[PDB]
Chains A and B, each alone.
Chain A
């Protein structure tokens, strides 16, 4: 009984493995493999370019962050004021077009 159960378990495992390998042979034909290679090369070139840009930008931001919280408050205020001026100008332009 012990021998029989062992033989049954081994046969089921080998069937499963055979069927897996047959599916992989159907999926990756030489033509497709070539395409997958082209796609890799484009993706790899993109990953490399973006990793370099991220590294340069992170280096510049680190120089401003060194001028303290007070500067950041000033920058926030400046930015708020520029945004309000831009909104008011935008409102004046829209009232002139309506003089029928």
Chain B
């Protein structure tokens, strides 16, 4: 009976989260953010250039 009550609260919170996730995905797309422009992607690209200079020397 306690769990059934708690389950109702959880369903309401889940609906709230789904709404904030859409709003955030829309803000990232408007800023022109693509995958290759990420820190991780760009670091990865710099690490590839150093490796290539070492091979050329």
Residues of A within 8 A of B (CB): 1, 3-4, 7-8, 10-11, 14-15, 17-18, 21-22, 24-25, 27-30, 33, 36-37, 39-40, 43-44, 46-47, 50-51, 53-54, 57
Contact = CB atoms under 8 A, between A and B. Distances in A.
Given A21-B20, A40-B45, A54-B56, 16 more contacts: A7-B11, A11-B10, A11-B17, A14-B21, A15-B17, A17-B17, A18-B24, A21-B21, A24-B28, A24-B33, A25-B24, A28-B31, A33-B31, A47-B48, A53-B56, A54-B55
By secondary structure, the B interface counts as helix
B37 to A, nearest CB: 4
Contacts of B11: 7, 11
